[PDB]
Symmetry: D2
Subunit: 267 residues, 4 copies
Amino acid sequence: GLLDGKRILVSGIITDSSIAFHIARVAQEQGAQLVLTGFDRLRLIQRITDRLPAKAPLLELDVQNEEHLASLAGRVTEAIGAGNKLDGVVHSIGFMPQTGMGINPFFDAPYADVSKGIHISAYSYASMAKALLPIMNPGGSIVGMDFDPSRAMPAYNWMTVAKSALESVNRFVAREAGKYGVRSNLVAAGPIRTLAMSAIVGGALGEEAGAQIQLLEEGWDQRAPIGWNMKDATPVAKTVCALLSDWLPATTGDIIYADGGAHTQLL
Amino acid sequence: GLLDGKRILVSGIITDSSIAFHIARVAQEQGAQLVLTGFDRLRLIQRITDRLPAKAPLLELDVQNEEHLASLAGRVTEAIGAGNKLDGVVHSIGFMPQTGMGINPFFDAPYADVSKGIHISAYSYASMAKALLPIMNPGGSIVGMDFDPSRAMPAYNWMTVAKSALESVNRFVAREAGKYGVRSNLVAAGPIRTLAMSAIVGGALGEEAGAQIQLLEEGWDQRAPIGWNMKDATPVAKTVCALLSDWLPATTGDIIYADGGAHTQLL
Amino acid sequence: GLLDGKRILVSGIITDSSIAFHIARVAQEQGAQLVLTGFDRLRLIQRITDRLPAKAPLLELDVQNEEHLASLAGRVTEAIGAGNKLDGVVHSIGFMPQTGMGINPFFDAPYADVSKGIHISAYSYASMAKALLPIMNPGGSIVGMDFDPSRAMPAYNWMTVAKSALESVNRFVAREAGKYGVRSNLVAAGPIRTLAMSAIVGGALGEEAGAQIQLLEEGWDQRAPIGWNMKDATPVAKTVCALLSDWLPATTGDIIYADGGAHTQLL
Amino acid sequence: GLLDGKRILVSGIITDSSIAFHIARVAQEQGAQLVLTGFDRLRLIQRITDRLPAKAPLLELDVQNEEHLASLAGRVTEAIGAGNKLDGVVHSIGFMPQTGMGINPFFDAPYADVSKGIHISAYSYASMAKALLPIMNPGGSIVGMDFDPSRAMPAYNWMTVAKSALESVNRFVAREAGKYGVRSNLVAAGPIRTLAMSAIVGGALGEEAGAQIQLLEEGWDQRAPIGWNMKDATPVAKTVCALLSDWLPATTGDIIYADGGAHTQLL
Ligand SMILES: NC(=O)C1=CN([C@@H]2O[C@H](COP(=O)(O)OP(=O)(O)OC[C@H]3O[C@@H](n4cnc5c(N)ncnc54)[C@H](O)[C@@H]3O)[C@@H](O)[C@H]2O)C=CC1
Ligand SMILES: NC(=O)C1=CN([C@@H]2O[C@H](COP(=O)(O)OP(=O)(O)OC[C@H]3O[C@@H](n4cnc5c(N)ncnc54)[C@H](O)[C@@H]3O)[C@@H](O)[C@H]2O)C=CC1
Ligand SMILES: NC(=O)C1=CN([C@@H]2O[C@H](COP(=O)(O)OP(=O)(O)OC[C@H]3O[C@@H](n4cnc5c(N)ncnc54)[C@H](O)[C@@H]3O)[C@@H](O)[C@H]2O)C=CC1
Ligand SMILES: NC(=O)C1=CN([C@@H]2O[C@H](COP(=O)(O)OP(=O)(O)OC[C@H]3O[C@@H](n4cnc5c(N)ncnc54)[C@H](O)[C@@H]3O)[C@@H](O)[C@H]2O)C=CC1
């Protein structure tokens, strides 16, 4: 298995359509031993993760909670056993208040909302690395989830800004992680029909936002030389596993695009 | 003159070595009528700006102050006269708390500090555009100051992250500004020996941070095919004026590099 | 005038819808004294350039002709007067054989064709700089015309490759030009309905190629936050003049996007 | 094994310090069945490849030889057996005449030399894909070797231009390869001390070129958050294997940086 014997923390499972659910599933299929972290609805997440091919301890982690972070590494050490360290960390956490997205005018997002979004979506990549690098093995890998923010787009608004911040954070995290013999990288995924995405497409953030995202999705598959299946998170999970593996050992502070190649094509 | 008859708001003068001081001076040399905005030390800024080739009304603008922003356009209209609108807006505002920079470990910057930095340095580009676009003429130009954050670097830490955010914000601001027939662009300047920069070089944020920035500056001039004079903000002021002019009329959501060409060269 | 007193060589006029025709016209409107170079059909080009606001000596330059290049600087010196040097050079030259474009399969372009295309479209940027830098003044500016090749696109095929090469060449030209106190930059223009473009849209390189380019043009204006008018080369001519001016004095080895901001927007 | 059962053509072995030698070795260690191609010195290459963990048919391929390419797929089919197709293709071919590199002035490289360099180094990526895609399986992977040309650098001169062309070609190859369910990607490696590199460092292309490359190598390891060992091609071979695998299944027309993360860091 690709991740045989590796111990890997996977954050960001909330439903069985979470990208992190698929990351966790593929990692397990590939021999990894997981510790999961979950935000807020731990009973729900436990029930969801019961469906993973293997049992995995689930730890509460609200990335905005200083104490959760301060206790994180001890709790993980408790879960994987004293003397054992993590080989991988998957950050699959993102949030932006509604005012920072969709048809709420870009200018109308109050900074408190944007800040909370950037906190959860960007800064927490650094928070997590800070918490976990002390308990990571040399040759370890931190992976976060990105959505290519190099160009502006409708609807994603301040979440795109948050991702721009995240990409910058990742480069700094790589500098820190390198001290530990650890890589830090993002996977920039194509659009995936998670519950939230489906809700946006269905107009939850305004009809025009829904229409634009639908157009975005369609254009993505069109541009993607190998196509893009927004209903299938597996290619993205595999890519995350690729980075968690020993097979990209010279790649760090970097972004791997698991988007069907859409970003390399204009039309 | 390049900016003859144009009315332009210039934020960010704090000392006579502020990049915005030079932007204001060059703009005036080029025929622009200025409104200045200043943060906090208005008496100081007035005295500094007395040295500009022309008188310019100075308005208080704390970009974190909602009321300042809410009143901004009325105050500007008051200053330039009812029925007159702005042709240009220069955002030359940046701040990051000390914990977000220098030898304070990257991981040790508390999010409240980072957030304040991103507020002033990134989000305020959107705040300013929100406040001023209603009083900007078609063919207008918003320009913000950038420091190329595409690669991580020592010492600049969360300010680089803030600039990554700013670049993303600028692309969204362009979408909004385009509705007004207004361009929005950043000038990514090479390093300029402002007071703060000199202080960092002198070790104000730690000796190693100072040493790294010094190396950064030296490498910049070396890489720059036309050299880079960190003691001369004029080439950057001119570039900002170029964007404020009618001479880059098809450029928006974009970044103009006024850095000696350093970013185009590896070594 | 923006280019008052500057002496500027403008290559690439072939018809009155040549981007270089508009560059030459705007430069003249802005006070520049021009020397034109023309390829092959000098009688035609003379007649076309008779329409420029001012007379300009026209010199033959086949960029693939070593002797033309070897004699170029002497001929220019002859035209502008001994003791006078150029302040600006505009490279607005591009060609790719039909096999390298349109619906001719990408794989089917014979290398001899591609090579000729890269010769005229990329290498000649270096050839021209080699020929002219000895007769350029400090503070001079070389500008070439680019079409953003960072992402692949239908129909443009090997011309996109040629532009990728050109952008790389420009960065090297900047290193050389910097020795002379000369900047070297590209303007990446949006699509302009030159005769050739109109012919491609009309199906000259295959119906599907025509259909794709039409879609490309439509998407460009849609994405452009300030719109894009493919029938108007003036915004691009102005941008070239901006780079020929003293107003981007710290920009070199670089690309200025005169494309309505289209490249900064995904959708 | 990562590449278990996959049939993969590996071009570009010339010595046991060829990056392709290490790609071939790692691929074999990972279960791949190889067909090798070799240029010119087939007796030498056979003797070199005798050292690979497994036997592999060696086929002559001069990428500038139309007949070699025209016969290539039949010869490969002969070697792997009728009814069997390739799963992977590794392009590890590069050449630039001396005049296009080192201290030979950039402007002094005759186009015939540059063209030959671009032919072998860029166009041949398309030639190889053209030859081999008809005999590649869905889910296949074409990988070429890149050296990040996004910024100009000393000494590499027209080879950097060739790599810029190659990166553009790769994006087009992805469009074609996608029709076959095949990915096309580049690995941008850090500098590797191949024989040629060592010769350049030793001054084979001029002392200043040697000095600059040495500085380049040193800076690379310094910038690389996880360091860079130019004497070790394994991390790059592994990265190529990662792309040949099923583990980056949504990545195409893309560049994977196996450079220690050096390109993500300024200083
Ligand atoms: N769905 C899509 O189209 C794409 C999503 N992404 C990114 O993938 C990552 C995963 O999101 P998805 O799986 O799409 O959605 P999701 O909603 O399944 O996952 C987001 C996760 O973030 C967690 N989260 C929110 N606030 C948190 C906090 N304070 N502390 C800890 N965790 C918190 C949520 O509990 C949830 O598990 C995010 O970074 C997202 O931006 C990237 C590209 C595309
Ligand atoms: N000095 C350098 O090397 C470079 C600086 N820059 C950027 O140029 C811009 C101008 O900075 P400099 O002239 O270098 O330094 P500066 O310190 O002269 O200017 C920064 C300005 O930001 C203003 N500011 C801070 N907080 C504010 C708030 N809450 N509201 C309104 N204004 C506030 C300050 O009053 C000051 O006028 C900044 O965006 C900076 O990041 C960009 C590239 C290089
Ligand atoms: N039309 C468009 O949509 C865009 C064009 N460009 C570029 O702008 C530049 C100008 O082209 P356009 O004005 O569009 O077309 P054009 O056909 O008016 O100009 C191309 C010029 O290249 C010259 N040329 C061709 N072979 C030559 C040789 N061996 N020696 C000297 N000159 C030679 C032609 O004589 C012609 O004057 C080209 O680099 C083109 O790629 C860039 C972006 C968009
Ligand atoms: N050594 C380095 O620092 C780096 C090299 N690369 C690239 O890696 C690839 C492999 O080169 P290296 O292993 O470094 O050197 P190498 O000299 O071992 O390999 C180059 C190969 O190109 C082949 N070649 C040359 N002309 C050919 C033709 N007409 N037909 C077929 N093959 C031909 C040579 O026979 C040789 O096998 C090249 O694309 C090179 O640019 C990329 C990054 C760094």
